Every structure is written in structure tokens, then in C-alpha cells.
Design a protein around this nucleic acid. Sequence first.
DNA 1: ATCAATATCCACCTGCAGATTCTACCAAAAGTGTATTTGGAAACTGCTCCATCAAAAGGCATGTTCAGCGGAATTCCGCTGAACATGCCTTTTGATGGAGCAGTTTCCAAATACACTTTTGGTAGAATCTGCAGGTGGATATTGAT
DNA 2: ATCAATATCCACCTGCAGATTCTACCAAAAGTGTATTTGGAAACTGCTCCATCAAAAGGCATGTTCAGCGGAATTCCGCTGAACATGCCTTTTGATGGAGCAGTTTCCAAATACACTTTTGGTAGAATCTGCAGGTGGATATTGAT
Lengths: 92, 93, 97, 98, 84, 78, 105, 104
Amino acid sequence: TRKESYAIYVYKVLKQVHPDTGISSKAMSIMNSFVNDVFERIAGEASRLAHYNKRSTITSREIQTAVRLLLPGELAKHAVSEGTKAVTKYTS
Amino acid sequence: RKESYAIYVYKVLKQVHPDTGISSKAMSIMNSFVNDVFERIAGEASRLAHYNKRSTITSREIQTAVRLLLPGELAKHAVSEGTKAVTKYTSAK
Amino acid sequence: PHRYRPGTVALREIRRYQKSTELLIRKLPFQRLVREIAQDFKTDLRFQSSAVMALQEASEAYLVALFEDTNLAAIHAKRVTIMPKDIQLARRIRGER
Amino acid sequence: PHRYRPGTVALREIRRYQKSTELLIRKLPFQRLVREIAQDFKTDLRFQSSAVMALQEASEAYLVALFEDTNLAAIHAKRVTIMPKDIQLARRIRGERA
Amino acid sequence: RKVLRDNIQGITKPAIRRLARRGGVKRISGLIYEETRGVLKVFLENVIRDAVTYTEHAKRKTVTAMDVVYALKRQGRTLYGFGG
Amino acid sequence: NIQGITKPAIRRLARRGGVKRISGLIYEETRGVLKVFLENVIRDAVTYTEHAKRKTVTAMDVVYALKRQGRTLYGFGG
Amino acid sequence: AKTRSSRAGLQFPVGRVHRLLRKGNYAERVGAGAPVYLAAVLEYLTAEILELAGNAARDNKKTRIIPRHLQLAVRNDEELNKLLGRVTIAQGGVLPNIQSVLLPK
Amino acid sequence: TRSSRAGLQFPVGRVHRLLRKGNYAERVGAGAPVYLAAVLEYLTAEILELAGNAARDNKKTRIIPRHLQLAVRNDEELNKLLGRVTIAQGGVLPNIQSVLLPKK
DNA sequence: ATCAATATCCACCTGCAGATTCTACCAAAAGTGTATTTGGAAACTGCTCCATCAAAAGGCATGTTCAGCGGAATTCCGCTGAACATGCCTTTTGATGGAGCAGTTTCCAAATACACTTTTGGTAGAATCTGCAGGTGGATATTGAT
DNA sequence: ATCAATATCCACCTGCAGATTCTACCAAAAGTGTATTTGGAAACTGCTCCATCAAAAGGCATGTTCAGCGGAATTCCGCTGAACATGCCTTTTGATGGAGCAGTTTCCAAATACACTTTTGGTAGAATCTGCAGGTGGATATTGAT
């Protein structure tokens, strides 16, 4: 059978930041666990947000507010940036 | 509307302690309690289901759920009451 | 004139306060503080009387629950007088910093 | 004959171990302890070695972080020697108990 | 309006004593009161930040008790009693 | 078994924890805790195990446990 | 027609509970036993606490349960205290408790 | 693909698939998988950068857990976002209480 | 300050576990194109409850005096943990049957989905009802002076 | 050990708000009953990967010695608690104007439902590869006795 994983995307993002840096196996795993974690967390709060508001759709709106709620100050900042940025690029 | 569990609590209230009443606040607090507990078991259930590539939540998950969330005697009794209620319902139509 | 030794009243005060449930912080003043702090974030905001209340029940509940941990720290230091460092060890351990 | 004063080697062990990541408990002895605690919830079980490692990585970690809040509690009491009372005190505040 | 100011002093020394009592505390240092107000301010800051966010996501201008409740639950300080 | 968790071992841990002096009583205290820890965790994993109708506990079962115990752990599964 | 609740021998509404299970997506589908078992646990838990509270009130010569009572019933019970070890009951106060060393001699 | 349209290295398609398949809500906006993709990737580089450093400043060119631990526990924000997380094989930051130092 | 027994470094070396590059493989995604559907934003507004102002009032905050006793500091001992050399019990390393973890086909019990029928429980709110808060006198403590 | 100054305990008494008891209405509900779909238990089958036997490795148990840390005891300065006087401002009872929350009909931009089709990420068996951990040396700093 098969087992998905973010590993591949991680490596990609690696070399765009440290062109010449390798990453341990155990290390890659931790990076994956990390991703899934965060994923579940944002996805989670977003779920709640919608429910609270008797809404039935999770949208960038939710993902954002969510991110504000989940991430620390400065971190949250950029996070929203990259955020709205990918959605602008995508639409236009 | 904006339902509550008020009447159901009140019934049970009248069951255990026949001549005792409950203040509007205390009920507010019992309602919160109920909802809260509801939300967790469901949560635990939800995930447990996922972890096992299962798409349905059956009395089976709701059970494990309760074993994971509640402690000692409370769970031991809870499980009982729950299984009980099911079979009684299961054997009728 | 008659007078109680230091320690006697304070105890009377724990027995008392640990026996009641009414809030301990002046109401109107608190509200203000909430309104100030909120305003640092937003502005032109309104509050359900009860939201303010919910906030008070929580704050006292947290502060009260805190002083206990604090009071423990002090004692662990062969003391009976809570000092800032007690409030701090508690939070350092609690995981609030 | 040359001796090292009380605390000097200990102090350099603090140095040694905060540098490495190695698991500090002997595998088998641990593994053995796991299964046993476990055999009281179900029987004739099996463990992915990978699951014993998680469990060990996890407990060590916890303990370590516990020896930290404890060492602070000892110092709060103007000492330098950690005692049960210190472990107890931390766990009590941690809400891990009461 | 009225430039809401220094209200953190609305939390009187008396009040901070009453609370220490329910806390089972007999003797209190002179520095506690201020340290305490400091701790209180942060508590509210974190709870109101979150609370007001929910209020904003709902496109409302009035902070509901529910907001405070989700705000509370989010930080693991769950409160029963206000429509939770 | 528990005694299998040796003094030198517990010594080392406290070292990583930054401890300089260690009371003799600290050992029988440590273990008791180490036991209480594993009990609460192993308990939940095994439950996750029974549920999956399985006779072997899988690292995921543990991770999941740790997770709900509020002790998330990276390195053994998303 | 027999409400599933009576079919199940419960006071709590089985219909409400199965319903909520849906409008709150916890899973794609929901087996008919699920709500039964849940309303069951819910009913059990609430009875358990109302018992303890009812008594609390009795001890304070009170005949109507108020928050404090609910607080008392919960904090004095080792098992319900851990189940609500992070929950805060508005208006419940705290259990009388003074550390030893603080007492006079 | 939607990921290249969003100029992201992360799989928008997969993130989308996981959202709906994660029973989070009834429906799902098309921009949400993108946005979340965006923020997952973002945090991902942020760690890699620091941890990459960690490797450098250790004279190593291969990132291992240690480095990842050294990168999170040393950064005020990341550490707070993972204050409840444990990285396998990561050890701790080198730290010793002042009072424990040998009195001179 | 003076050696000298040791722990800690730095530079160079090489094998090898384990990260990496090669290429066929192909199910399962992910994307596209069509057709249908519906969530919830917009516009109108009925109406709840929030900010606000007036005003009388006494609970409670503020500020001071006065000294009880707690915290801090200093000293000092014996008793407990740290360092270490010593003898070996066992945890660690590596080879080989077999037990369960899964991959896959099967089919039916059960969970949709949907058109109807009817029992329920929020509730707007006029009437009726009742536990207990808060005032009050009085008998039983609990303290702190001598 | 007697004692007066005070707080405590308590069973009464009772006005008022907050809990209880309903006739009156129902839109949202929960139930009923085929019709239609399928999630997953059940059984058969490898093939991992795990429990176990067994051999050469290397960390723990043990005891003797004493350095130095914790706890006891003693001391005193002044911090912090109790009692008191003065009066500010929080609380309490009303009431008014109008922000903004919440309910309703409306209809279109974006989401869902296959159907089809091109594509990419996950083994995997095979090969090739390289960052770095162990490992020798000898340079030099730390520690500790004098």
C-alpha cells in the first residue's frame, strides 16, 4: 500500500533557503510531524470558528483568523502575509 | 429557538432528590457541563474514527471514547449504563 | 482597649472568604479596566453586561487559584509571607513563562 | 594520588549531558519495564520497537524537564540538593497532582 | 469618552488582599500588590485579545459573553455558567 | 523491573536537567513517578490498540496517547 | 410512536443527541447506537453530580441547589474533580482549606 | 497545478483533499487550501532557516534533530508555538543555574 | 607562585552506515470541462439591550499610628552525599523461525435519502407561589490580658 | 487559671425577588415508512518485523573517606498587620434615546457532483555515494595540592 508525507515538499523548501544543506532522516520525520501538527491545529480552530458562526464553509477568512488565534505575534504577522499573498497570486 | 438540556436535567434532578430544586444559575452551569462533556466524547470519537480509516462513528467509538476520557469508576459505570441503554434499544424493532 | 495579635484576624479572613462566593473586586472599577485594555486593541466597542461578568469570574478564579500555588512556594521556603518570587516560581513552574 | 573536589565532576557531567542527546536509560531494562506495566491492561501483547523508542524518548524528556522545575524549587528554598519535597512541590504546582 | 487611564489601580490593595485570603494566604509582602496587578493585566490582555478576535470575525461590534467563553476555552480556562 | 531503572541512569537524567547535588531519597521518588507516567500513557495507547482489534501496540498508538496526554512528540508519525 | 429515548429507557432526548451529532460533523455517518450510548453516558454523569450536589445543599440546610453546591460536590469528589480539573464553575468559591503551618498554637 | 499558480512549493491539491477529508466543515472555499498551503510552507522555511544555521554554527552540513531543537528552543516565538511539543533526539539547551557555579 | 595529574581541544584520517541518484511502474491523485445546486451576502427593519445621566447613601477604600514577630543574617556541627578504584553481572550486538499486521475480494446489514405525519418543548407572559436573604436578639464559643 | 472583650452560632421571623405553575400557540422536530447506497466485517494469504536463543562487549554495584552542604539556634531590625478616623465613590433604582444585533425575503457567485484524462508522488530493487563519527596524537587549559 502507500504512505503519503510532506517530506518531498520539505526538501524542496530546504534548498530554496540553504541550497547546500542536507537533512537527516529522523529530522525529516520531525519536520513532517511538525507540519501535520500545525495543519491539524489551524484546520481545527477554523472548524470551530465556522461552527460558532453557524456558517458551513471554511474559507481563507477562517484560516486567517484561525492563524491569528494560533500563532505568536510577529510569526502570525508574516504568516498572514504569505497567506493573502498566495491567494492573490492564485486568483489573478 | 435556543435549546437547552434544562428539562432533562430537572427530570433526573427530581429522580435522585425528589424535594430539591435548582437555581437558574446552577442549571446554566449544568447545561454548560453537559455540552462540554458532549463535545469531548464526540471529539475523542471523531479522531479515534479517523485514526482507523473508519468513516462511521458507532456506539463502539463512543465507548472507547468514554474509556479514554473518563477516569476509574466513572468510566466503568458509564460504560455499563451505555451498553445497557443500547441493547435495551437494540432489542425492540 | 482590647486587641487581636497579628495573625488572628487574617485567619478569621480566610475562614470567611473561603466560605463565601461573591466576587472580591469592586465591580465598576474592574469594568473600566476591561474597557481600557480592550480599547488598546479595538475601539468603538460594546460589552454585554455578562461578558464583563464572565471575565471577572475568570480573572478572580485564576488569581485566587494562583495565590494558592504562590502560598505553597513561600511555605516551601520556610516562610509564611508570599513575596513576588513566590508568584514567579509558581508561574515558572506552572508554565506561564 | 589526585582527587576531584565534591561537585566538580558532577558539574562537568551537567556540561557533558546537555551537549549530547543520547538516551540515558539502558534499552532492555526500560523495554522490560514497559511491557510489564502494560501487561496489566491486556495480555500476550507485542510492541513495535519503534513504539518503545517513542515511549522512552518521551519519558526521559518528561523526567528531564521535571528535574528542571524541581532544581528550581530546591533553589527557591535556598538549597542546592534536590529532595522529594522539591519533586513533590513541582508536581503539585504543575497540577499533575494536588 | 474620557481617556480611560490607570484603571489598573481600580484593583485596590484591599481587593488584592481579599483574593489572597480565599487563596488561603495569611501574610502578604509589600511588593505583592503591584506584582499582582502586573499578572492580572497580562491575564486580561491574553483573554481579551482572543475574545475580541472572535468578535471581529463575526463582523460584530459588541463583545458577546460567548466570545469571552470561546476565548477562555481556547486558553484552557474553560468557564461554566455563562451560556457555555 | 522498576529497580531496573538504575541510580547511574536517574543520575544522568538529573544531570541533563542541570542538577548538582542529589539526595539519596530522590531515587525511590523518581521511579514512582516514572511509573505513574508510563501507566497513564501506556493505558491510553493500549486502549487505542484494543480498538483497532490489534495484539501489538504501534508507535502511532503511543503518539496518539502522548497527544491527548498533552505530551505531543515529533519523530514517529504525523 | 416510541421516542427512541423510551425505547432506550432514558430521560435525555436520544433524538436531540443523534441530531447534534450530525450538525457538528464529527464523522461522515453516525450509527443509530451512537446517540443512544452517548445520551446514556450524559444522563449518568449528570445524575451522578446532581446526587452529590443535592446532598451538598442538604448539608447546608438549603433545599435548592446553587453553584457553590455544584462546586462542592465536584471538588470533594476525587474523580469528578479530575474530569473538571480545568473547568471553572462560576460562583462556586473554593473548598475551605488552610495549610497547617499557618495555624496558631 | 494550483500550487504553481499560487507560486507555492507546497501541495495545494493535497491540502485541499485533506481539509474536506478531515471533516472540518460541510464545504470548503477554494482559497482556503491555498492560504493554508501558504502558511504551512512559510513556517516550514522559517524553521529550516534557523536549523540550517544551527548546522552551520556547529560545523556540520547535515541537519539532524539536535539542530531543529536548538532552532526552536532558542527562538522566542517558535518555542512558544511548540512549548508543548517534544522533538525526538534533540536534547536540551546548554544551561546551568548561576548559584550552581563554583564560588570563586 | 609552583608542578603535575587530567580533562578538553584541534587537525587529520578513513571506513560505512545511510543519504542520494537511476529508472521503470502505475494507482491514485490532481486538474479539466459540463450541469446543477445552494450557502450566505445584501437590503429592509423590528426590537433588544447597551451607554449614559441623574441622584441619594453608606459600604468600603485610604491613610496613619504603633509594635509584634517574622524574615534575614550569622554561625557552626555532624551527617550525608561526591569522588574513586575494584570485581563481574548483564545489557548490548547479531542470526533465524513464525506470528500477527495488512492487502484484497466479498456481500449484506445498515446507513443514507426523501416524502409525510405528528408529538414536543421553547416561550410570550398573566397568575400564583415559596425558598431564602437579611434584620434581630440571645446563648455558646474563642482570644488575649494577668 | 480566672476572665471580660468579641466574634460565632443559631433558631426565629418575613418581605421580595426569583422559581414554579400554565392556558395558549407551533415551527422546528422527531418519528414513520419504503426506496437506494455502501461501509466494513469476515475470511483467506503473505511477508514483514517481532520474540527469542546466544555470544563477546562494557557499565553498574559496592565500600571506604571526608569535603562541604543543610538544618539548628540565636538575634534584631523594621516590615507588615490591627484598630481607627475621615470621607470618597461605588452601588442601586430609574429612565431615555438609539446603536447594532438579529430576523426575513431575495438570487448569484462560488461550491458540489460525475466523467474524462493527463500526471505525479510512493515504493523498490540496484547502484552509487559522502558527511561524519569514531580514533590516534600531542598541544594546552583546568583543577588542585603546596
